[PDB]
Amino acid sequence: GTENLYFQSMLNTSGSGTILIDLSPDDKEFQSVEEEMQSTVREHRDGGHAGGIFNRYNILKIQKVCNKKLWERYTHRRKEVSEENHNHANERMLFHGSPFVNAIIHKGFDERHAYIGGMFGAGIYFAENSSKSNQYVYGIGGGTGCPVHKDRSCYICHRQLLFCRVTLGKSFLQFSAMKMAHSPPGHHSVTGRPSVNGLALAEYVIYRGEQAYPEYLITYQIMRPEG
Numbered sequence: 001g002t003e004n005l006y007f008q009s010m011l012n013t014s015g016s017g018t019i020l021i022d023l024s025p026d027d028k029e030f031q032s033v034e035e036e037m038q039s040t041v042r043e044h045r046d047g048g049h050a051g052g053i054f055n056r057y058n059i060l061k062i063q064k065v066c067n068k069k070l071w072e073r074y075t076h077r078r079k080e081v082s083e084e085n086h087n088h089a090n091e092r093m094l095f096h097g098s099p100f101v102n103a104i105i106h107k108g109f110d111e112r113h114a115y116i117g118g119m120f121g122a123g124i125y126f127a128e129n130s131s132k133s134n135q136y137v138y139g140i141g142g143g144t145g146c147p148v149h150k151d152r153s154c155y156i157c158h159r160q161l162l163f164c165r166v167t168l169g170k171s172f173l174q175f176s177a178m179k180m181a182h183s184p185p186g187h188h189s190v191t192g193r194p195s196v197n198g199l200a201l202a203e204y205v206i207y208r209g210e211q212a213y214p215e216y217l218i219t220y221q222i223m224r225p226e227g
């Protein structure tokens with residue numbers, strides 16, 4: 001596509017203030033995000049042990065997260081990374097899943113709530129594939145599942161993902177485990193690459209919460225296959 005759907009300028013809400021904007025399914029912005037959500041689903045190695053067993057989702061809502069402070073903090077970081085990387089910010093849309101969605105869209109991503117015991121250390125993790133971020137909606141490795149039924153493969157409870165503007169800058173390409181506290185020298189993010197005897201699907205790690213904007217809030221639920 002050659003239309004500017006994902007990377008439009010944000011305008012002053014008022015603001016306090018996180019305001020959600022309801023996108024109608026007839027809008028091409030809704031449809032693009034929906035299709036990106038649906039088409040990037042892969043068959044996982046766990047057998048769906050973490051994210052659940054599915055092929056597609058039931059997209060219920062796609063809202064656009066509008067926050068003045070979070071925006072004028074992302075742009076400042078983006079401009080900074082750009083200047084340190086030959087005017088190339090390396091911005092792209094990536095999925096994100098965590099139990100902290102409500103906090104992320106009100107306060108922004110927060111590195112100080114990282115993990116350090118992750119594959120690439122104390123960073124905030126993003127994915128090309130929507131079904132990968134889905135494995136982290138109810139916590140690391142799926143956690144105990146949905147709060148109501150304790151089911152990691154629940155088709156009843158509604159879930160939320162984030163489709164985010166991510167500034168990658170000069171990304172450090174890694175195959176093996178490399179537990180970082182910050183982005184490696186000269187770089188601004190880490191890219192986990194697919195490889196045999198390693199990762200099956202890619203992943204992208206930043207170490208500054210200001211380096212990502214939670215543009216799209218997706219309310220969905222995984223769908224039972226037939227059968």
Ligand SMILES: CS(=O)(=O)c1ccc(-c2nnc(/C=C/c3nnc(-c4ccc(C#N)cc4)o3)n2-c2ccccc2Cl)nc1
Pocket residue numbers: 097098099100103104108109110111113114115117118119120123124125126136139140141
């Ligand atoms: C299993 S793994 O691949 O290594 C892996 C590791 C880490 C992540 C990963 N990537 N991003 C996050 C969380 C980001 C975040 N931003 N703000 C918050 C927050 C805000 C307020 C409060 C309060 N009160 C708590 C948190 O969180 N996480 C994460 C961190 C700890 C626990 C679970 C997860 Cl998903 N994703 C995957």
Ligand SMILES: NC(=O)c1cccnc1
Pocket residue numbers: 095096097098125126127132133134136202203204
């Ligand atoms: N929490 C996530 O969305 C995520 C994305 C990629 C890898 N690990 C976790």
Ligand SMILES: [Zn+2]
Pocket residue numbers: 146147148149150151154155156157
């Ligand atoms: Zn449930």
